[PDB]
Amino acid sequence: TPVTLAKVIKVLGRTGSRGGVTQVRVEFLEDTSRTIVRNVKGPVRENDILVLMESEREARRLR
Amino acid sequence: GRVRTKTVKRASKALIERYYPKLTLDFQTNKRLCDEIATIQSKRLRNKIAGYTTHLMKRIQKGPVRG
Amino acid sequence: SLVVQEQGSFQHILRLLNTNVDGNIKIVYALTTIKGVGRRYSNLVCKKADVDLHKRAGELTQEELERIVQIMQNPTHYKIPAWFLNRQNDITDGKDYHTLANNVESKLRDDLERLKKIRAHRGIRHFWGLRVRGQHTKTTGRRRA
């Protein structure tokens, strides 16, 4: 299964009822200009790099 | 948690306005001159006054300041 | 200080004063299975019998076994200052005894039987199943002991 990499650009804020979840805006270093927001758990910074199984899902729990 | 009491801010604002040619953009000289142009009951409090004054006046070098 | 290898001139489990000593273990901790004998009382008497501690009670000899049973019933005759026995300065004769395995209960029942006879507070505590050593039973040791 084609696991793909993603690279954080903006940590848009912290979300989740208990504060655990984070919404960060990531980019793709392969096949660039694809920008998607994701709901992330652990601590994260700017320019961070992470792994996504899938790209066909936005981050939902906003505000 | 670095927010200063009015005692630091009011003294810093009052000090700089009537002593701007006396002050200088360096903290070490500012804390030294403050010992003679003002009466402060603690060195820690005196440093807080001089720390804000050398912080206020860098922004004085960057354009105007209101108040 | 040297290390010697061992060979299997073995014999398996056997009885010992109606107390089946567990095999395949070192002799001192095998003699702990003998009632009225602990780790201390087994270590000393084994050193008296000149036996190596690493015999593992399996490659021993009957000649050493008949030596230690003599030290069991008659320990004072193998250089002990007589403060080391199970029953120090007993009631019956004032002599220091070491009650062996099978009959620790008999002197235990007779001790309580005397306490039951004398009608002392201790003996009444024993029959009622309460705590004799002054331990509080209000909220501890409730269902057992």
């Binding site: - | - | 290390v3 290898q5 061992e6 060979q7 299997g8 095999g23 395949n24 593992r56 399996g58 490659e59």
Partner: protein, 69 residues
């Protein structure tokens, strides 16, 4: 469950199998043989003075041994 003494049907297995073991420990011998801990403990003590395997680290409670050559 496990053997407690050393005899020829158990000694020859120890000699014929311990070489080509990459790693030998007290528990590995108890896992791969019927010997106990102290029987395993005299194993790593003995066979090194015969020099069949080479010591890399020497520590109490922990065997760190590698086959020689």
């Amino acid at each position: 469950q496990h053997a407690v003494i050393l005899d020829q049907e158990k000694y020859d297995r120890i000699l014929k199998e311990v070489p080509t073991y990459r790693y030998v420990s007290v528990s590995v011998l108890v896992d791969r043989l019927k010997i106990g801990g102290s029987l395993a403990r005299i194993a790593l003590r003995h066979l090194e003075k015969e020099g069949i395997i080479k010591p890399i680290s020497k520590h109490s409670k922990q065997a760190i041994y590698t086959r020689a050559t």
